Design a protein around this ligand. Structure first.
Ligand code: CA
Ligand code: CA
Ligand code: CA
Ligand code: CA
Lengths: 76, 76
């Protein structure tokens, strides 16, 4: 039920919908991550285990997560 | 495309790979995103365009992006 729990973390007032202010506030948290949380994210994408994300790995991750380039990237 | 563009933007020292520090900076950038930029991300996920992301829309995004959700779980 992790997905529902994550949704609940985003939906501050619990009215069943994530607003602009709620999404922005949630992103603010994602950008204040600890060194170890970043390492955990690195482990997920660093498939060849060299400690870095090369372009092959980035492309592979994007192909498995179309929302990264179609949704999240629209931020940058 | 935006893939190569985004990769390059965060590969600070241009060695072709994203390090832990560079990934940390990318996350902090995402975290300091203006509501205006966040709005573009929200519009992509907000399928019915009511200005909010309901659970159904949130679920669809999660299902299509198992990798991103794993990263999010590192925080939420
Ligand atoms: Ca809400
Ligand atoms: Ca690697
Ligand atoms: Ca680099
Ligand atoms: Ca909606």
């Amino acid at each position: 039920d992790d997905m529902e729990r994550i949704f609940k973390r985003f939906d501050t007032n619990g009215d069943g919908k994530i607003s602009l202010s709620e999404l922005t506030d949630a992103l603010r948290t994602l950008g204040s991550t600890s060194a170890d949380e970043v390492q955990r994210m690195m482990a997920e994408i660093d498939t060849d285990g060299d400690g870095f994300i090369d372009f092959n790995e980035f492309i592979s991750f994007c192909n498995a997560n179309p929302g990264l380039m179609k949704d999240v990237a629209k931020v940058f």
